Design a protein around this ligand. Structure first.
Ligand SMILES: CC(=O)N[C@@H]1[C@@H](O[C@@H]2O[C@H](CO)[C@@H](O[C@@H]3O[C@H](CO)[C@H](O)[C@H](O[C@]4(C(=O)O)C[C@H](O)[C@@H](NC(C)=O)[C@H]([C@H](O)[C@H](O)CO)O4)[C@H]3O)[C@H](O)[C@H]2NC(C)=O)[C@@H](O)[C@@H](CO)O[C@H]1O
Ligand SMILES: CC(=O)N[C@@H]1[C@@H](O[C@@H]2O[C@H](CO)[C@@H](O[C@@H]3O[C@H](CO)[C@H](O)[C@H](O[C@]4(C(=O)O)C[C@H](O)[C@@H](NC(C)=O)[C@H]([C@H](O)[C@H](O)CO)O4)[C@H]3O)[C@H](O)[C@H]2NC(C)=O)[C@@H](O)[C@@H](CO)O[C@H]1O
Ligand SMILES: CC(=O)N[C@@H]1[C@@H](O[C@@H]2O[C@H](CO)[C@@H](O[C@@H]3O[C@H](CO)[C@H](O)[C@H](O[C@]4(C(=O)O)C[C@H](O)[C@@H](NC(C)=O)[C@H]([C@H](O)[C@H](O)CO)O4)[C@H]3O)[C@H](O)[C@H]2NC(C)=O)[C@@H](O)[C@@H](CO)O[C@H]1O
Ligand SMILES: *[C@@H]1O[C@H](CO)[C@@H](O[C@@H]2O[C@H](CO)[C@@H](O)[C@H](O)[C@H]2NC(C)=O)[C@H](O)[C@H]1NC(C)=O
Ligand SMILES: *[C@@H]1O[C@H](CO)[C@@H](O[C@@H]2O[C@H](CO)[C@@H](O)[C@H](O)[C@H]2NC(C)=O)[C@H](O)[C@H]1NC(C)=O
Ligand SMILES: *[C@@H]1O[C@H](CO)[C@@H](O[C@@H]2O[C@H](CO)[C@@H](O)[C@H](O)[C@H]2NC(C)=O)[C@H](O)[C@H]1NC(C)=O
Ligand SMILES: *[C@@H]1O[C@H](CO)[C@@H](O)[C@H](O)[C@H]1NC(C)=O
Ligand SMILES: *[C@@H]1O[C@H](CO)[C@@H](O)[C@H](O)[C@H]1NC(C)=O
Ligand SMILES: *[C@@H]1O[C@H](CO)[C@@H](O)[C@H](O)[C@H]1NC(C)=O
Lengths: 318, 169, 169, 318, 169, 318
């Protein structure tokens, strides 16, 4: 007698948005914006190092905290907030650029630069770098005059990179607490450090003066760095206040660095990270962290954007 | 105690498909789902879903620092840039979803219409539209005849005499 | 001296609504607007309008200076970035409007069709399409009968005998 | 006899664009791109300061022009082109970064750093900073030797921030027109200024030499600044050519800074600004200024984008 | 040995137009193209094409260097920005094309339907839909009559008696 | 008897993508992503200079390689990889910013600054700048003491820009291989160079020391530059290690610079360039080079995006 055409419906309708309507009910919808966070660092498949109290830049110079990571190798690199690049108070020049380089280095390979010295002390040590007793950066040499107040001989040291990769060279300038202390270490008169390459040229002067005490010290050691091209040479000319490198650094390969405050997990597999954990999602967007890194869904301001996966829901006439 | 079609409600009992048939005759009332229309609709929606799962091969790394804050000028430039692209993606996301949902709803309405139009062309001159999305069949259509319509084996030639007779006085 | 429907013009006299009816009988010619179709169309367009008024909560501050020009390198980087996102928004704006206008026009065409289709299902077998978007009514339809069609109280059962008679010889 | 279905139309049709057509007439359309500008700064509801001839950075050091704004408080901050940060010719290092900081500071709170001095003059003044007579920056102290050519004693001054907000510390280096003039002020020999923190370390040397005359002066005073973290300390070691701070600065809260060339209006309420006025619009886009700031519609290159607010217009057959 | 319409295939022989007519009578089988529907479709597609040819007046210059690499920090900031906008345009391009193709296909389907619906309104009560997108004509329609349908000069009044007679017994 | 409505179709269908389907066949489609490259530089209509072995910054200072381009004029400027800004080993400070300025300069107009000197040599020359015999930068003057080890007189030179355009002023600091070599040239004692403007102020010290040998030389000449506003003045105060400018530079107009490694073609007309050639296309996107410059289609990651230019293709039932 009669045949009717129809479509299914529910009493359990879910609202979505369109070009025209706001809150139009459809039969079924799904979320496009990921909000589910895994408060761990899913490190399965990736060789991972947790620097802990070692700052990433410290792996190059070598304070006590970084003694394990002097030649580390990794696919994933994690920096911790408690980390520190420094024992004797100081900071890197162009620090962030260098960090970014080391974050994707794959780790570092160290190699002796082979500097040799004559009428000069090299055993410069401090209480801030305790290792059994007083000590200093593992990869560096704190050069002094010889006895006390004695003149520091003008020196010239050079290093050639005989490898097919750029060499990371680092050196420090020491700022004594006073011109008195500077003289006691390197002798009277003005002091100059010039660093020349075929692509780099800079000059440095020490700056004795009272600073606030950090780690019980008012002195500052500031670090400088350059990348040395293959077959290129660096030459160091100096007469005091110079922190010499003992080894150069070579990047191992490819990696990725993050800054996290949550534990590492080796069972879960991930590819998108932020400071609070791992984002694992096939969803196109996320509202967790705008600074998330790796292979991630795009960050959006919205916490939810429902995509209709069903027709417009129309309740049945009772 | 009548039955009604899509033009004035959905069917909360149609639980084995998106689109379907509801008939009534001497044998009583019945409801079955249509495969071809339902599958088409499902194929298109899942098609959208796959199109949004396709991950990006672009890897992004840190350009700032939340432990040691970068220099102010370059920091504000970075934040200004990030928030700008965040605005863009937030816009894109909002519009994409709104655009797709508008399409999902419409293409579903299309499928419903195409199904209705198909049945109409099957019944030829043997039925009339009742206005609710149903067809008054002007001959006797048992369960067998009703099934014949659903699987497109209905031959209007068989019932045309009986039908045209009843439609006119 | 005939009247015509949507299939070959609009009505510059229809000033109290977007969609409507125009009839002619012994009582003469008349024109009224349909509420449900007009309101639906207006609801959707205003819906678009509200969707574009929704302001952003993102506040942006200066990253350069038009009194003391910034350093050249960082300045060109900033300008390059700004012009890039300007290109993106200009693209977005152009496409958004073009996309919405395409939809606004189509959904209006849909409403017109749905109205036409509705009336058709009301008149059942008592009328025929004249091709201009009008229905030739094969019985007498006074002003009262015409109003009955507009408010969906027309019962084709009342006129079916008279109508089918006239349609056939 | 006959019933027809139709739609309205006009002879007054307006053209829009779609995916396919260019210039398709619709019944009614509206603009999406704002172009209407209010050549004023709608400041209603916001505490507003018009710096006028005072440069924003001048509020910190305190030339005569900025004497009113030494401890200003605002929700909205306006810089004027005629403004100047300087009386005695000079400029800030990292000036723009500092400006951006002050633009959203909410104003500044000043507090004495409490430096005390012995065998030294502090009444350094100049003709370029006239205030009744010759003078100097209100927040700074121009330190000299004592009589003339006399030696400037090595000094060390420190300041500790006992507040829960970072302190804006500023100091200047004076570059005399000649080594002759430098000696007359601070004495013979080389001069050094070192500034140390727990997060900052720098060093400075004066640079005597002839510059072009600005404000009748060929000397230059250059300013340096840092943000001092809570509970942290700054130490100044110097022996001449040092412009000392007298007070530190603390940011009041939250604000927004603009650069405008039009009058201020206190009756109108606004939230989007540019150099030429206030943009008040619910429209999503604008073609007024790409560098507009605040809460603004997005800038676009197009002057007009018409959005159809009605159906396709089809003229009635005559 | 029958002929069929759009509802179950296209015509690889229709080589002088996008849409067309295929008839069969005593004079035999024939195929011609419809101008108005074909031109409309072509006008809209070319309209899209022009809309994408409209070049941009934005000129962009170098902000980095591939001979002398810039400073690392500003270099990574630049690369991060460029790759970000590259992601945006890649998204935009992908979506634009996908969106337009969806529309191109649909508007073509619309034109086909509008053509079919037009012919239907021409034939009035003199024909019936066969289900394949064709019309069974219930009177004799020679080549002249067939041409009359294609150029909209067919008057159903001329054949209505003969047609209604055959449709009923 | 029967009339059928239909649409055309092909057996030669081409797949495209939509919102729902992947690989839906349409009758006809076209490419939106340009991939066709012209490995030439279409320079028709544009005045073009191929710097070759001359570096762009060299056009200002004037090594032998750039002698032709000392006052060049162009619409399009091409840098070559073999190019060099330098004869005597050295580099510009803020080099890239300056390059970007010169790339859109339209070329340069040179004008004598009119510096005159007394008890001093100006004929400083080197083997690295060979021109017939030993020589030096064409636009610069290598100033020396007079005989050998003799004292270099304190000097002050100033230049005023009497034109309505900014003047590009350049000067160099010479870093000798040793303090011995520095003394031989400019005399004993410390050396200072101060450069003052009304908008610029800087100071410079030489830095004698051993560098690696570039062009047979271990010495480095570093260049500094500023833009001098109309009616403004620069003043140079120095006592040695100073490379003086002989002429200033003025930008001719408007241009565009590229870095290419392919030949120049003067018959073809173009507007989009990259290192590998010219992109000539009406297509909206391109997958050739992300760093392409000029008026270009947007770069995308995809190599192909097919746009349907025909209906959905449906094969005819056999
Ligand atoms: C600077 C200051 O605050 N003003 C003082 C007050 O503070 C003292 O300052 C002195 C001077 O710096 C501090 O002496 C330093 O103390 C360290 C422990 O905290 C440590 O003993 C330093 O000696 C070593 C070291 O152990 O690291 C010894 C190493 O062998 C040295 N290595 C080399 C290669 O020389 C090395 C060097 O001597 C310096 O580190 C090089 O920069 O360090 C030692 O110098 C003292 O700790 C501070 N004490 C306090 C309580 O602040 C007060 O003394 C005050 C008293 O009147 O006088 C102010 O002027
Ligand atoms: C430098 C130059 O152009 N070359 C000169 C010519 O120009 C004169 O230069 C001198 C030297 O700088 C100028 O002297 C200065 O004039 C000021 C007025 O324009 C003012 O009088 C300066 O004195 C004060 C001051 O009033 O500000 C006095 C303050 O008490 C001082 N405060 C302290 C703490 O010392 C202060 C200092 O002396 C300096 O400002 C510190 O930098 O300033 C005064 O030094 C003179 O104005 C210039 N005049 C002209 C016409 O250019 C010519 O004199 C020329 C004549 O042969 O010689 C060139 O070498
Ligand atoms: C520095 C170094 O590697 N250590 C040496 C070794 O290397 C030699 O260094 C000397 C010192 O620099 C080199 O002398 C220079 O050689 C040039 C040719 O290669 C050239 O002859 C330089 O002289 C001129 C010049 O021609 O350019 C002469 C110009 O007239 C001068 N112009 C002016 C205005 O003074 C000019 C200046 O003298 C300087 O360029 C200013 O910087 O340059 C000349 O100085 C020598 O070439 C190097 N030779 C080699 C083989 O490396 C060895 O000599 C080694 C031997 O024991 O000793 C190391 O200490
Ligand atoms: C409601 O929508 C969700 C999302 O599309 C559907 O859940 C999907 O089911 C399929 C098949 O079981 C899975 O492949 C997907 O992974 C599921 N997605 C999610 C997010 O769970 C669900 O089937 C829909 N509801 C109904 C009744 O069909
Ligand atoms: C033409 O379009 C404009 C814009 O949508 C309509 O004007 C709006 O009218 C409503 C109600 O009166 C207001 O809430 C809006 O603020 C108005 N917008 C603007 C921009 O003025 C107008 O009504 C439309 N024309 C007709 C005849 O309806
Ligand atoms: C298939 O699509 C292409 C692209 O639109 C068509 O080729 C165009 O033809 C017109 C007129 O001859 C030209 O103005 C365009 O420049 C052509 N474009 C390209 C990319 O060549 C082609 O005509 C279409 N195929 C058919 C059978 O019409
Ligand atoms: C960048 O944004 C973060 C997030 O709000 C903020 O904490 C940081 O201070 C900003 N950087 C600078 C330099 O202001
Ligand atoms: C940034 O763009 C503005 C607007 O054209 C221009 O005036 C300014 O010079 C640009 N900045 C730099 C550093 O070139
Ligand atoms: C910028 O990207 C290019 C392309 O991969 C890369 O070669 C270059 O090293 C990047 N710049 C920096 C500073 O890393």
């Amino acid at each position: 007698d009669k045949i009717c055409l129809g479509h299914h419906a529910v009493s359990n309708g879910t609202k979505v948005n369109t070009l025209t309507e706001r809150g139009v009910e459809v039969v079924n919808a799904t979320e496009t914006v990921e909000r589910t966070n895994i408060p761990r660092i899913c490190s399965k498949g990736k060789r991972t190092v947790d620097l802990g109290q070692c700052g990433l830049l410290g792996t190059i110079t070598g304070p006590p905290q970084c003694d394990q990571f002097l030649e580390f190798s990794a696919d994933l690199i994690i920096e911790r907030r408690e980390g520190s690049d420094v024992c004797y108070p100081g900071k890197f020049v162009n620090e962030e650029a260098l960090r970014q380089i080391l974050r994707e280095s794959g780790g570092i390979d160290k190699e002796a630069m082979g500097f040799t010295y004559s009428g000069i002390r090299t055993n410069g040590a401090t209480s801030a770098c305790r290792r059994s007793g007083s000590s200093f950066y593992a990869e560096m040499k704190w050069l002094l005059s010889n006895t006390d107040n004695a003149a520091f001989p003008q020196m010239t040291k050079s290093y050639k990179n005989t490898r097919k990769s750029p060499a990371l060279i680092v050196w420090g300038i020491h700022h004594s607490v006073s011109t008195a202390e500077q003289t006691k270490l390197y002798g009277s008169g003005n002091k100059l450090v010039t660093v020349g390459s075929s692509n780099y040229q800079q000059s440095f002067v020490p700056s004795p003066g009272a600073r606030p005490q950090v780690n019980g010290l008012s002195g500052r050691i500031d670090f400088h760095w350059l990348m040395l091209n293959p077959n290129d040479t660096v030459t160091f000319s100096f007469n005091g206040a110079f922190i010499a490198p003992d080894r150069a650094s070579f990047l191992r390969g490819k990696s990725m660095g993050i800054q996290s405050g949550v534990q590492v997990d080796a069972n879960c597999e991930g590819d998108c990270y932020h400071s609070g954990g791992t984002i694992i999602s096939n969803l196109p967007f996320q509202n967790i962290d705008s600074r998330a890194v790796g292979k991630c869904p795009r960050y959006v301001k919205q916490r939810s954007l429902l995509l209709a996966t069903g027709m417009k829901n129309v309740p049945e006439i009772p | 105690g009548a039955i009604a079609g899509f033009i004035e409600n959905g069917w909360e009992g149609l639980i084995d498909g998106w689109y379907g048939f509801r008939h009534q005759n001497a044998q009583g009332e019945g409801t079955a789902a249509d495969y071809k229309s339902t599958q088409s609709a499902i194929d298109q929606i899942t098609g959208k879903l796959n199109r949004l799962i396709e991950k990006t091969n672009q890897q992004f790394e840190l350009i700032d620092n939340e432990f040691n804050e970068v220099e102010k000028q370059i920091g504000n430039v970075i934040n200004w840039t990030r928030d700008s692209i965040t605005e863009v993606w937030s816009y894109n996301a909002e519009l994409l979803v709104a655009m797709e949902n508008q399409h999902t709803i419409d293409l579903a309405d299309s499928e419903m219409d195409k199904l209705y139009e198909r049945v109409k062309r099957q019944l030829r001159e043997n039925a009339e539209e009742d206005g609710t999305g149903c067809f008054e069949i002007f001959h006797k259509c048992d369960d067998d005849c009703m099934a014949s319509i659903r699987n497109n084996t209905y031959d209007h030639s068989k019932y045309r005499e009986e039908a045209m007779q009843n439609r006119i006085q």
